[PDB]
Amino acid sequence: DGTLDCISMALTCTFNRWGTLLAVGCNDGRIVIWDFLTRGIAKIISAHIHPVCSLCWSRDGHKLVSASTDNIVSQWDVLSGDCDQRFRFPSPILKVQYHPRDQNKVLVCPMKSAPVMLTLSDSKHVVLPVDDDSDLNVVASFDRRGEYIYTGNAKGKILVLKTDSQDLVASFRVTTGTSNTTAIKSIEFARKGSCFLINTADRIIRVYDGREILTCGRDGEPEPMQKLQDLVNRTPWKKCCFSGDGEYIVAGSARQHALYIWEKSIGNLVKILHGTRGELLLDVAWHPVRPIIASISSGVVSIWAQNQVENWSAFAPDFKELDENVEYEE
Amino acid sequence: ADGTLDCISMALTCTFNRWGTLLAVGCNDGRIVIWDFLTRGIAKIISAHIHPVCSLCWSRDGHKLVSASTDNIVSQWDVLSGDCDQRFRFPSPILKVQYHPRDQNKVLVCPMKSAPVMLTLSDSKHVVLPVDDDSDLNVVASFDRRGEYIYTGNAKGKILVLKTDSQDLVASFRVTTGTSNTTAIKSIEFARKGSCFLINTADRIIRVYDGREILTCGRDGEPEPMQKLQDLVNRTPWKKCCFSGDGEYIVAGSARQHALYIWEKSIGNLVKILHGTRGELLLDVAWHPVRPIIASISSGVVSIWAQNQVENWSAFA
Amino acid sequence: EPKQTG
């Protein structure tokens, strides 16, 4: 729908809180920050020697936290390019995430270890509790306010811990209807409200109200607000997330390079965006405050946007853009 | 044969919101078009005036737009809904409307014939500001950056600095030519960083002052401008000028060629000229508050001039 | 001191 020609070997991407900038982690170990206002590069960071597989913006928009494949986790100053701090873990890192209300805390999700929460100023840490003991593969997410941490393991068990104490305050196993378990591949929260979604190995996206889970308490059976799946092709989902307002959900099918978009409330498929057929889908993000979606496939970023009813059905004045490509400088 | 020429709008005036995600554009048909930098298309259209809108200003919080038409009507618009919040009828036309940069309950209106007026909108009191010598034909004015002072300038080159709340004269001076004649003050613009501002005068010289030096000087001072900027080759007069977002550059639109001149403020040096399509009349210019982007309106068409940082790579097959 | 045009 319009790809970015200035960025190559894209691997992961995330918007800042206002969606003026797009941080793009790349296969060459660089973070390239693209600017929605100038439609050009804002900042390049030489961040690793190994591919950048995970990024997260601090709430104040000044810091980036990244993870390599060398098991390094670094915090960057987006203005200066400087590395404020750097941690090396045993085993590789799936996910890094700032505490949403406190950028001194970051959550790390290692491959074979339990999840770890750090504080950057005092280089202290917590390893978080774990249910099946042989969890090994566990993913975790702060909730929208950062007062709880949700985890999911390979056996379909969701722990709800309180971020300060790490105390189990709610839990439930996610059901295949049958009774067989199903692995949790990711947990994502809406930017507005209390809803979150779970991507699972049975290829059904489950939408839950966070409060519905707290009420159900320890070892509950909360029922999903919504169950999203593709019953034609039974497609697996590479990545899912909410719209910034939280009432739509996009999920990327790598298998058929397409993005499905449902309504969260009612549940019906609203539309499917098809990219080229050669390419493999790597990442998807939804703009925090606009009907814009970013896609990475085969190292190319694609922006999908939606303008309102007008744009010439309204006989508006003409807009022309004159762009002056200049060389990136620090 | 014709048809769509009848209803397509001409842009006449434009202004960025505080973060430069939105460009508000006023048109000949009274509409206000809100253009979105993030999606690169129109977000909203406000059906605002019966007549061309000529002045526009965004509130600090981004939710309200104040606008002036050729009806001598000053309206406040709620941008999310598109509803009018409040309307004023003036006698004589309006040159300029401006929100107080820190308190959007106050609006400065500059009528052509009259002296400038400051509205409080929670309750609609106005209060005329003082004017010297009563050449009150063509008084221009502007809040300074934080809105503690209003700066006025008249057709005889007299600049007053007034306290905003108390309205009391705290500094003044008179801008003269190299021949000790006065020249008319055509516009006043403050930068978004620092305390410098600029004036466009009828003698085709943009003067840059430090507002700190001017308060220091007090009533009937002689402060000298930090910079005097002008077309040395063609002596073009200036339709409109303003600072870059950080205050280090000044753009100035030629009233006689579709051309934008850009100087570095500190050393007064002219670094580039943007030539629009030949033959068009330049109507407005705005520098983006936080980016190297300039919007300009000429012959009803909006132009976005943007620098885009790229790397040198390109394809080989 | 450049110039750009169009």
> CA A85 → CA A26, A73, A77, A209, B93, distances in Å?
20, 8, 10, 36, 60
Q: Using CA of residue B56, residue B57, residue B58, residue B63, what is the dihedral sign?
A: negative
Shortest distance between the Cα of A15 and any Cα of chain B, in A, equals 12
What resolution in angstroms, rounded to 1 decimal?
2.5
Separation of CA B197 from chain center:
12
Pick among A289, A319, A328 to test the B interface (most B CBs inside 10 A): A319
CATH 2.130.10.10 fits B4-306, yes or no: yes
Question: Would you say A66 and A48 are in contact if contact means Cβ atoms under 8 Å apart?
Answer: yes
DSSP secondary structure, B89-156, as one string: E-SS-EEEEEE-SS-TTEEEEEESSS--EEEETTTTB--BPP-STT--SS-EEEE-SSSSEEEEE-TT
How many CA atoms within 13 Å lie on the side-chain side of B210? 9
Distance (Å, whole) CA B15 – CA A325: 24
Q: Residue B3 burial by CB count (10 A; 0-12/13-18/19+): exposed, middle or buried?
A: exposed
Taking one residue from A and the other from C, the number of pairs with CB-CB distance under 8 angstroms is 3
Q: Which residues pair with A260 in a beta bridge?
A: A251, A272
> Scanning the structure block, which residue is given the tokens 């840490």?
A125
DSSP secondary structure, B270-307, as one string: EEEEEE-STTPPEEEEEE-SSSSEEEEEETTEEEEEEE
Distance (Å, whole) CA A10 – CA A31: 9
Distance (Å, whole) CA B126 – CA A174: 65
Distance (Å, whole) CA A104 – CA B235: 57
> Scanning the structure block, which residue is given the tokens 């407005």?
B284
A contacts of B37 (beta carbons < 8 Å) = 36-37
Distance (Å, whole) CA A245 – CA A144: 12
With CB atoms and an 8 Å threshold, state whether B311 touches A6: yes
Instruction: Determine which helix (DSSP H) or strand (DSSP E) holds A35, and give its type and residue range.
Output: strand A30-35
**Tokens coding A100:** 């949403």
Q: Coil, strand or helix: which one is A108?
A: strand
Question: Would you say B56 and B283 are in contact if contact means Cβ atoms under 8 Å apart?
Answer: no
Experimental method: X-ray
Pick among B28, B38, B296 to test the A interface (most A CBs inside 10 A): B38
Distance (Å, whole) CA B35 – CA B25: 8
Q: Coil, strand or helix: which one is B80?
A: coil
DSSP secondary structure, A160-202, as one string: EEETTT--EEEEEEPP-SSS----EEEEEE-SSSSEEEEEETT
Q: Using CA of residue A77, residue A81, residue A86, residue A88, what is the dihedral sign?
A: positive
Neighbouring CB atoms inside 10 A of A51's CB total 18
Sheet holding B301-310, edge to edge: A319-327, B301-310, B293-298, B282-287
Amino acid (1-letter code) at residue A107: L
Distance (Å, whole) CA B73 – CA B163: 26
With CB atoms and an 8 Å threshold, state whether A320 touches B309: no
Q: Coil, strand or helix: which one is A15?
A: strand
DSSP secondary structure, A289-308, as one string: SSSEEEEEETTEEEEEE---
A contacts of C6 (beta carbons < 8 Å) = 322
